[PDB]
């Protein structure tokens, strides 16, 4: 397939070829043009707070070691020995000053440097140039309010610019709340879906909630529960949708601070968020204080998703075109009482974790939609994302980005897939930028 010419996503993001969820050659191409190029979630400060703390993480199909340095910075390196290529670290988290390879005993620092080689003097003499044998380093590592992302491409935009218009929506919760903590360890489960299936669902999909999650809404004791079985459409002005130049997007469901949490947690949460909102009105204004305590379903392009307020944090780690390894953490506000943080973390896993009853509702949808993309008669078929097209705006005086001023639509799908197609058809960031110079005009046509 010629990725320069092939129209995988139609103009304005209105449709995508179903093969994008099944084609293994395209998957291999995504490794280069999506995963090696864009910002990928690694960890949180709260998981590696002290010097020497480390975790392992995936970046695409590659595995990296992410380590807190003595100077307080974080550096990340391929989890692969520079000698004969053995995996260096076999655990998920720990604290160490370095990492020793179990094959021939080479020792690397927490800073990636090759520090020791057994019997170096007797064996290599002065011939081994250790200075050139440091672990392969992730070029770019940056933080968004404690959330640490990596990028293999030195040419990428800074993380903040990459978030584009999405950052404005995230800041009330990520910044103005006093800050968030990630509660580990994550749940980890493999699903037989393409990574884009859950990515698209979280970025942009409020339409599915009432029907897909009918049983979870009815059973589960929650604030959005009037939606069960499409019994009731959210009222006018119940929310909005947005998207951005570099593909990140989200839905906003006004005021839904208790999110998916069962009636057990609803009063406590609604009190806590309301009280903080009252303080924030003075600092950031009523609209942004309201956004703080509003439910955001967001995808940070390509494959990191979250539900703020519900506290769900997801990484859709790609394995192949029909296999994804799902990592699920809980996010909590640092100034919540510790007992509430504990119960919130359990509730996140209860709903969206490995035995998450809500997450379970989504399984067949994502799996079959993905697997159908391999089927002969469906490869060249068009997945539709036209809901709300011709009603989006850009440059609004209150809400930035390409915005659909309705709770339910496909605005964020369109922006996600516009960015996806611009990357797939480009060889580098310069080409992506050239392909994106009229991004918002494309999205607001008709």
């Amino acid at each position: 397939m010629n990725y320069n010419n092939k129209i995988l996503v139609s103009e304005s993001g209105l449709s995508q070829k179903h093969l994008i969820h099944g084609d293994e050659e395209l998957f291999q191409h995504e490794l280069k043009t999506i995963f090696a190029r864009n910002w990928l979630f690694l960890t949180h400060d709260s998981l590696i707070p002290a010097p020497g703390d480390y975790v392992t993480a995936k970046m695409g199909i590659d595995e990296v070691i992410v380590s807190r340095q003595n100077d307080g910075s974080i550096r990340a390196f391929l989890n692969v020995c520079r000698h004969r290529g053995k995996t260096l670290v076999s655990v998920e988290a720990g604290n160490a000053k370095g990492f020793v390879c179990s094959y021939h005993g080479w020792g690397f620092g927490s800073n990636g440097e090759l520090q020791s080689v057994p019997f170096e003097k007797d064996l290599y003499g002065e011939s081994l140039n250790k200075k050139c044998l440091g672990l392969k380093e992730v070029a770019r590592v940056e933080s968004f309010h404690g959330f640490i992302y990596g990028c293999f491409d030195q040419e990428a935009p800074p993380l903040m610019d990459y978030l584009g218009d999405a950052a404005w929506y995230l800041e009330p919760m990520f910044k103005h709340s006093g800050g968030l903590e990630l509660v580990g360890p994550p749940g980890k489960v493999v699903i037989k879906a393409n990574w884009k299936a859950p990515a698209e669902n979280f970025v942009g999909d409020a339409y599915h909630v009432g029907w897909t999650h009918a049983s979870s809404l009815r059973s589960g004791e929650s604030i959005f529960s009037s939606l069960a079985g499409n019994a009731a459409l959210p009222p006018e002005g119940a929310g909005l949708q947005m998207t951005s130049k570099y593909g990140s997007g989200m839905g906003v469901l006004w005021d839904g601070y208790s999110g998916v949490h069962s009636a057990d947690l609803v009063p406590e949460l609604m009190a806590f968020g309301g009280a903080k909102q009252e303080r924030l009105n003075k600092e950031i204004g009523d609209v942004r204080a309201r956004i703080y305590r509003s439910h955001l379903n967001c995808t940070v392009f390509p494959n990191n998703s979250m539900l703020t307020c519900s506290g769900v944090f997801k990484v859709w780690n790609p394995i192949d075109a029909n296999t994804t390894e799902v990592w699920t953490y809980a996010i909590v506000e640092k100034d919540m009482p510790e007992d509430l943080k504990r119960r919130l973390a359990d509730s996140v896993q209860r709903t969206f974790g490995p035995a998450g009853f809500w997450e379970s509702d989504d399984n067949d949808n994502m799996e079959t939609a993905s697997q159908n993309g391999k089927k002969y008669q469906s490869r060249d078929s068009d997945l539709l994302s036209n809901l709300g097209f011709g009603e989006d705006v850009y440059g609004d005086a209150v809400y930035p980005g390409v915005v659909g001023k309705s709770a339910i639509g496909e605005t964020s799908y369109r922006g996600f897939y516009r960015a996806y197609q611009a990357h797939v058809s480009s060889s580098n960031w310069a080409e992506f930028e050239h392909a994106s110079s009229t991004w918002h005009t494309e999205l607001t046509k008709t």
Binding site: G52, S90, A93, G187, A214, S219, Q349, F357
Partner: protein, 192 residues
């Protein structure tokens, strides 16, 4: 067990061993086997309401953890070791049961098929609470659905059971430390 000598053994596991090595009561092992076999039968036929009524105590904690992979020599990194796949009280189990029985649970049509294999049953009365029965057992749980989806789960269960209403012994705690860190079963939406 001396865990300074048996270097791979956790304090928790050593404590649990000691429990069953003392008073062996053959009759209690037999009762426990019946209890668990009947529980598994109710679950296998998807009689989830009957399971709650007959097998599960009002004060239950039903917990399945997934523990982060750490170095065997690790002694500095101190953060949360595990997350809860399940950590349910009775009301939370009831929510899950209602979710299973809801006619708009689309994933339950066509009907799932469950088969459970319960082995290695051990039973011992608590030392201090003469009405608390400790039961350990291992389960293989086979779930089949949708023509060609097959998921098999493997786990050891540390249970406490106590006589409740009508003198019926009911589950008051189940603890499972799930042995596979990354699930390869699509989900863990089964009652172990």
């Amino acid at each position: 067990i001396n865990i300074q000598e048996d270097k791979l053994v956790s304090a928790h596991d050593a404590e649990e061993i000691l429990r069953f090595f003392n008073c062996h009561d053959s009759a209690l092992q037999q009762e426990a086997t019946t209890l668990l076999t009947q529980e598994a039968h109710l679950l296998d036929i998807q009689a989830y309401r009957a399971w709650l009524e007959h097998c599960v105590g009002s004060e239950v904690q039903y917990q399945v953890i997934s523990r982060e992979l750490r170095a065997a020599s690790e002694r500095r990194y101190k953060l949360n070791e595990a997350m809860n796949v399940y950590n349910e009280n009775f009301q939370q189990l009831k929510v899950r049961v209602e979710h299973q029985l809801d006619p708009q649970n689309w994933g339950n049509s066509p009907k799932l098929r469950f088969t459970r294999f319960i082995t290695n049953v051990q039973a011992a009365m608590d030392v201090n609470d003469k009405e608390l029965l400790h039961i350990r057992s291992n389960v293989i749980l086979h779930r089949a659905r949708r023509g060609n989806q097959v998921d098999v789960f493997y786990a050891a269960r540390e249970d406490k059971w106590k006589r409740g209403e009508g003198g019926v012994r009911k589950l008051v705690q189940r603890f499972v430390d799930y042995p596979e860190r990354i699930l390869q079963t699509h989900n863990l939406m089964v009652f172990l």
